[PDB]
Amino acid sequence: AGIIDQALAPPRTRKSYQKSMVSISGTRAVIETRSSKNIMTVDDLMTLFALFTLTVQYHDNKTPLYITDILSLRGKKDSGPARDSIRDSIDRIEFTDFQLHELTGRWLSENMPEGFKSDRFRFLARTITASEEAPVEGSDGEIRIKPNLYILVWEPSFFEELLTRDYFFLFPPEILKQHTLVFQLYSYFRSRMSRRHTDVMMLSELNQKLARNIEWRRFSMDLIRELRRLSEGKGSEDLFVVNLWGYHLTVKSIEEKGKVVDYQVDIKCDVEEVLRY
Amino acid sequence: AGIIDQALAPPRTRKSYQKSMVSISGTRAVIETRSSKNIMTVDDLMTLFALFTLTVQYHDNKTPLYITDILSLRGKKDSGPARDSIRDSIDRIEFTDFQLHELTGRWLSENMPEGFKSDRFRFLARTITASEEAPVEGSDGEIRIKPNLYILVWEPSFFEELLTRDYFFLFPPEILKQHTLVFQLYSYFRSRMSRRHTDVMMLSELNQKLARNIEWRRFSMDLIRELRRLSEGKGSEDLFVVNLWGYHLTVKSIEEKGKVVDYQVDIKCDVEEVLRY
């Protein structure tokens, strides 16, 4: 859940294999993501977290989640294309296998002096669905369903962590309705920013840190438009501040002659973080 | 479930999708078998059952299994190609998803009458592996591992069904190392003939109900060689009896010169057959 965000597919990409290089605790590892259909994209993250929330709120095992509650938590208007979109997202999450291969040998026991560890993980161990419409056959005869009721059986150990230490798994119900760049920014501040309470960063670094292959103009215009929409009316386009559910930002534009680059400063208020449930 | 036998791939087949029509309890249904690699074949069944036995034998959750125990239980001499073969069977079992789609709408919930139910199942929810050799990047650019320790995490419902009820799918460990036709014969004797005391059969009937695509020469030579092998020498080439782990058989020759077939008299004994653990 912490490293999976680094091994997803680009948005709107339909592929069945992706090999990414990662490093955790100094240990370099190769993370593979494969599916019999299309692997998870970055945009699916939100949907995944939605499931997380709906798994925690229900238990207060097998977790029944209705499609309408998912649409509501995602802040999307109920319609055919919307239900089909969430259905495609959950379908990508369901058939995605992650596998982390550690490249540095470790000592395990007297019988295994040098041992390389690999972990093959899958979020949903089982899924039972209930649909109003009948399945369709499609090309090659492969079934396609339109479920309204989901019944999730998570991976056991992960499920035991879905009912224990529900902080990194519980995002604010309002951040799950936000833009993809806002979600990625809040998720980046939530995991890689517990070291300090004040920080200094640029938008140019934020592309390479969050959405690299997105060009600087689209990234800056979209994310700046969103943060400006969530900002307070106190400032102009050159200087404004955003609450961001505990991550009080302070964006300031830097100009050469007419061209601009933005510069943001955050002050992490840990209280409102836990308050945002 | 007990319908996976109709969902597996034919022997010597390496594919990623299969679809079958299956009627269960009067309802027409479709079973799809998917894998990002190769789906399970029939010849993997024994290995799967081996895992079963070992998972029941260790807990006497997570289940550590060593490849040495799998090779010994399957009756395989420890070597390179043997370890590779077992690893390939376990790899096909690990990445195989099954899915049962009901094509007839039935009553599911007071808000979904005549709804359509699907069930996406997977034997292994999670798999941690310990390998002695280093991860190798093959010619296809994908990581290939050579594990020796299998920390297995089964599907929760199937695991609970696998720890308490150890009588539906547990075979005598000595049958997991026999010829494939003997294993198929014993499985046919446990599935069919539920509580029938005695019955009389033909090797031709056993040929068509066990291995349709096997020549009558190889069926008689292999099956009669193995059954006649596991029998006290009290008889001759034309009359012998086999215990067969609770299914006491009696095989005799038929129809004299140049044209032959075998009578097979059975007598079921639930005491020995079930108690053999």
Q: Which residues in chain B are contacts of A114 at CB distance < 8 A?
A: 132
User: In this structure, what token pair is assigned to residue B44?
Assistant: 């993997």
Query: Quick one: how far is CA A22 from the chain centroid?
Result: 17
Contact: B153, A149; criterion CB under 8 Å:
no
Q: Based on the number of CB atoms within 10 Å of its own CB, is B57 exposed (0-12), middle (13-18) or buried (19 or more)? A: middle
Other beta carbons within 10 angstroms of residue B113's beta carbon come to 11
Q: How many CA atoms lie within 13 A of B274 on its CB side?
A: 9
Query: Measured between CB atoms, which of B101, B127, B133 is closest to A135?
Result: B101
Q: What is the dihedral of CA B53, B54, B57, B63, to 10 degrees?
A: -130
Distance CA B180, CA B43 (A): 8
Query: Measured between CB atoms, which of B35, B145, B155 is closest to A125?
Result: B155
**Nearest C-alpha neighbor of B126 from the set A263, A37, A125, A129:** A125
Q: Is the separation of the CB atoms in B244 and B271 below 8 Å?
A: no
Three-state DSSP state, A49: helix
Answer whether A112 touches B (CB < 8 Å). Answer: yes
Measured between alpha carbons, how far apart are the two ends of chain B, in Å? 21
B90 Cβ partners below 8 Å, 6+ apart? B47, B51, B70, B150
User: In this structure, what token pair is assigned to residue A253?
Assistant: 């534009």
A95 Cβ partners below 8 Å, 6+ apart? A35, A36, A37, B34, B97
Q: Which residue reads 């029509």 in tokens? A: B21
Rounded to a whole number, what is the distance in Å from the CA of B229 to chain A's nearest CA?
38
From start to end of B103-246, where are the E strands? 116-121, 124-131, 136-137, 143-144, 147-154, 198-202, 239-242
Q: Which residues in chain A are contacts of B127 at CB distance < 8 A?
A: 119-120
From start to end of A62-109, where are the E strands? 63-66, 96-102
A93 Cβ partners below 8 Å, 6+ apart? A40, A44, A47, A48, A51, A123, A124
User: In this structure, what token pair is assigned to residue A92?
Assistant: 């990508």
Contact: B116, A30; criterion CB under 8 Å:
no
Answer whether A149 touches B (CB < 8 Å). Answer: yes
User: In this structure, what token pair is assigned to residue B57?
Assistant: 């034998």
Rounded to a whole number, what is the distance in Å from the CA of B17 to chain A's nearest CA?
8
Distance CA A195, CA A40 (A): 30
The angstrom resolution of this structure is: 2.6
Question: Which helix or strand (DSSP H or E) is residue A55 part of?
Answer: helix A44-58
**Determination technique for this PDB entry?**
X-ray
Distance CA A18, CA A41 (A): 11
Answer whether A91 touches B (CB < 8 Å). Answer: no
Distance CA B230, CA A13 (A): 57
The DSSP secondary structure of A232-269, one letter per residue, reads -TTS-TTEEEE--TTEEEEEEEEESSS-EEEEEEEEE-
A2 Cβ partners below 8 Å, 6+ apart? A168, A191
B91 Cβ partners below 8 Å, 6+ apart? B37
Q: Based on the number of CB atoms within 10 Å of its own CB, is A37 exposed (0-12), middle (13-18) or buried (19 or more)? A: middle
Q: Based on the number of CB atoms within 10 Å of its own CB, is B1 exposed (0-12), middle (13-18) or buried (19 or more)? A: middle
From start to end of A147-259, where are the E strands? 147-154, 198-202, 239-242, 247-255
Distance CA A149, CA B112 (A): 9
Q: Apex CA B157: angle with CA B151 and CA B161, to 5°?
A: 90
Q: Which residues in chain A are contacts of B34 at CB distance < 8 A?
A: 36-37, 95
Q: Is the separation of the CB atoms in A144 and A131 below 8 Å?
A: no
Relative to beta strand B198-202, strand B261-268 is antiparallel
Q: How many CB pairs under 8 A join A and B?
A: 155
Query: Quick one: how far is CA A29 from the chain centroid?
Result: 21
Distance CA A224, CA B145 (A): 45
- Closest-CA residue of B relative to A113 is B132
A152 Cβ partners below 8 Å, 6+ apart? A51, A55, A62, A63, A64, A65, A124, A126, A127
User: In this structure, what token pair is assigned to residue A267?
Assistant: 């002050």
User: In this structure, what token pair is assigned to residue B109?
Assistant: 């919930």
Q: Which residues in chain A are contacts of B101 at CB distance < 8 A?
A: 135, 143, 145
Q: Is the separation of the CB atoms in A10 and A41 below 8 Å?
A: yes
Measured between alpha carbons, how far apart are the two ends of chain A, in Å? 19
Residue-range domain boundaries for chain A:
1-277
Q: Which residue reads 């696998």 in tokens? A: B162
Q: Which residues in chain B are contacts of A129 at CB distance < 8 A?
A: 117-120
